[PDB]
Amino acid sequence: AEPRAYPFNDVHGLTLAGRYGELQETEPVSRVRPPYGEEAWLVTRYEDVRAVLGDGRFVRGPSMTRDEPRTRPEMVKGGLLSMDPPEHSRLRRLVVKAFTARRAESLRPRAREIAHELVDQMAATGQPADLVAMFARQLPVRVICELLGVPSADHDRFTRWSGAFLSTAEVTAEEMQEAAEQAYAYMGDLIDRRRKEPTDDLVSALVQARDQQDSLSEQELLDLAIGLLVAGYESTTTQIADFVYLLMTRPELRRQLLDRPELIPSAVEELTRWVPLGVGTAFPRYAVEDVTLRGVTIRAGEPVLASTGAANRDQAQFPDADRIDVDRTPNQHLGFGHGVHHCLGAPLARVELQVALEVLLQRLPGIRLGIPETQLRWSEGMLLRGPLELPVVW
Ligand SMILES: CC[C@H]1OC(=O)/C=C/[C@H](C)[C@@H](O[C@@H]2O[C@H](C)C[C@H](N(C)C)[C@H]2O)[C@@H](C)C[C@@H](C)C(=O)/C=C/C=C/[C@]1(O)CO[C@@H]1O[C@H](C)[C@@H](O)[C@@H](OC)[C@H]1OC
Ligand code: HEM
Ligand SMILES: [Mg+2]
């Protein structure tokens, strides 16, 4: 009876559903029924979403058993986002000792070179070129190859395997399983090589990482490396396609960044706030005990969807929240999460998104859609929202 069908967002674009603003106003903790899995609470105000994501009483562990609210029939379980302190905390300390802000920044010149190569290839094939296939789907996985220390000769086949892990892939289950097996075997052998002769890449640094006198096991290293790959690939790819879609359809955004390229980092933050990247809200948290939130009792065990897409568009937190203002300040958005699970690749994701906009505007300052905006084909992957193809001219 009472729960609302969720997701509210239409996948065929980046429009924030008007339902979220309505619930922010008058029903900030509400019930939703997803296409698959359990009914759940949905939390939409910036304050409340931040509160749930930062509260020790809201955990992720039950994701390992539960029939989670979701938009696809299958469930992916495990990785860092399935874990709770203290087990989560230990892995996070070790991974961040290796995966530093310094290391992320140090990849900016290689990310620029790879971005320029991808534009070179677009220019070589000629116009219109598909920005999604040729650029957005290529830069983040090649940057992960560079991050981890995959030798250059293996980037193309590593990119091919990794393509099978995207929610937009049309491959068979057996095709995807073969790609997973090859990527895991490849990464294991890469870790064996770096254990034998360390160099200055992330795999070597993960081997060497110590926390107090603790370290990552051989199997933790391999599982965490694969986890970084999936966490850092589809999201960054989709966000690149979405940011350039916005650039190409909003003349003042493009003008402002052509005129003052120094605005690019601020524009990356503002677009990360504005773009409701998720179809709905994934990764439900579970109450460990009864919690009272905005007068509503969330019972021990119940799932709670804390919508960062809605939170980032809350009129109570961001003045004129639906406006894209590249100079917006402050901008304490939740686009890279909040609390203990907050995106650990965020420094790198920011480098990649900044480099993408920098290189495309420098090289292709007239970049624009090659077809009417109403003709764009949107992904029906049901996890993130973005164009399947972006035919561009310049
Ligand atoms: C929307 C992003 C999300 O995408 C996903 O969750 C992607 C899921 C795709 C759609 C899945 O693939 C489908 O599986 C079906 C059973 C068959 C489909 N085909 C073959 C007919 C197939 O397309 C999964 C099962 C693919 C495999 C390789 C996989 O486990 C991928 C995981 C990818 C995870 C993600 O890319 C990243 O999400 C990560 O999920 C982990 C479970 C978390 O721990 C966390 O990682 C650190 C988190 O990142 C922050
Ligand atoms: C634009 C690109 C990206 C976006 C929008 C993004 C967003 C996020 C968000 C919102 C979370 C928290 C999810 C939750 O708590 O429910 C998260 C977690 C994570 N991100 Fe990202 N991310 C991006 C890029 C990357 C990259 C490049 C990497 C790695 C190289 C990465 C690695 C991870 C990992 C490992 C987690 C799980 C952290 C944990 O559970 O402790 N991300 N990301
Ligand atoms: Mg050149």
Curated annotation (Swiss-Prot):
Residues 60-83 are annotated as: Disordered. Belongs to the cytochrome P450 family. The keyword Glycoprotein does not apply. It comes from Micromonospora griseorubida. It holds the Pfam family p450. The lineage of its organism: Bacteria, Bacillati, Actinomycetota, Actinomycetes, Micromonosporales. Residues 65-75 have a biased composition (Basic and acidic residues). One of its GO terms (biological process) is antibiotic biosynthetic process. Heme binds at H88, R92, R285, H341, C343. The gene is mycG. This is Mycinamicin IV hydroxylase/epoxidase. Its EC number is 1.14.-.-. Substrate binds at G78. Its cofactor is heme. Changing F283 to A/V: Decrease in catalytic activity. One of its GO terms (molecular function) is monooxygenase activity. Pathway: Antibiotic biosynthesis; mycinamicin biosynthesis. Involved in the biosynthesis of mycinamicin, a 16-membered macrolide antibiotic. Catalyzes consecutive hydroxylation (at C14) and epoxidation (at C12-C13) reactions with mycinamicin IV as initial substrate, leading to mycinamicin II. These reactions require prior dimethylation of 6-deoxyallose to mycinose for effective conversion by the dual function MycG enzyme. InterPro entries: Cyt_P450, Cyt_P450_B, Cyt_P450_CS, Cyt_P450_sf.
